[model samples]
Target: SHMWKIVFARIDDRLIHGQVMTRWMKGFPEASIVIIDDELAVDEFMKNIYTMAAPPGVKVKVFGVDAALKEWSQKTSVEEKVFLLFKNIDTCKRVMDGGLPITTLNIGGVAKTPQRKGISQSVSLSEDEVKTLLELKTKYNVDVYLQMIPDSEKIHLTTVVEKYFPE
Candidate 1:
């Protein structure tokens, strides 16, 4: 059995914040938050800050991509459940490709950049990033969709691609 049961997995550049803490966490109150970010893992100060930001009774862990993969691979059984948070699509992709058993992905937020076009109010994706997301869906059989919060409507990635990046 998997060491940790992943209750929810999300790609949010903000990682953990007011919305996540206040809105999303309510849905999985028992699940510990696992943040995957290469830079944040090494930055002890920010890591501590993020960890401290979690509400009382909610555990938070930070791991880089490779470290997360290793931890997942070695585990046999555990009762812990996790709410996985990735800072970007690339890090999510790395862990998923390395065998994280994520079946559905929530694209909550990706900040606007010169290279990325807005797919939703909170999400923007570069053409290449869009391609990567599509690959995750088709190759890994993961369901990718955009929804800011649990109450909001879920928008499939294919619909966004068809509307914004028609080819």
Candidate 2:
């Protein structure tokens, strides 16, 4: 049995922007970017906008959570390496629940609203988000970490929880 190799997975609210195009894509040069976002997938206009933003020769596709699971489950052999992006932690959770073999997750960017606190310079999480990430790590064995770019150091979810949201 063969499986699609997920080269990298990230939770970036900006999705496919300059940082993703210039920084992350260089790290996974061969990967075809797969964005799993329920809202963006259905919005034809915005979907095209993001897809068009990809650099030349780099492919990008946006799929809904359910659609992504269906496509991944049906594929027989590994055709290409995937650099997956999720707009939010909840969408990532749904895809993981649907059986995506995502081991490492990078929290690249999440805007800090009043409800959420900063875990990293560019990333923030609410209590529920922290809880969801903790669950992903403890239960599924996902190596969840926060690193805004390839050059930065990775801070694991466990350490963040212990320091920021101590119980």
Model 1: residues with Cα > 4 Å off, grouped in runs: none
C-alpha lDDT of all candidate models, in order: 0.87, 0.85
Q: Which ten residues in a row have the lowest lDDT in candidate 2?
A: 1-10
Taking the tens digit of each residue's C-alpha lDDT, what string does model 2 give over 11-124? 999887764555788888788889999999889987888888886788998889988887887656546788999989999999998899898999988999999988777898
| Clashing residue pairs for model 2 | none
Clash list (residue pairs), candidate 1: none
TM-score of each: 0.93, 0.92
Write one digit per residue (lDDT tens) for candidate 1, span 1-167.
66778888999998777646558888897888999899999999888888777867888899999998877767575557889999999999999888998988999999999999987788999999989999999888988999998888788999989998896
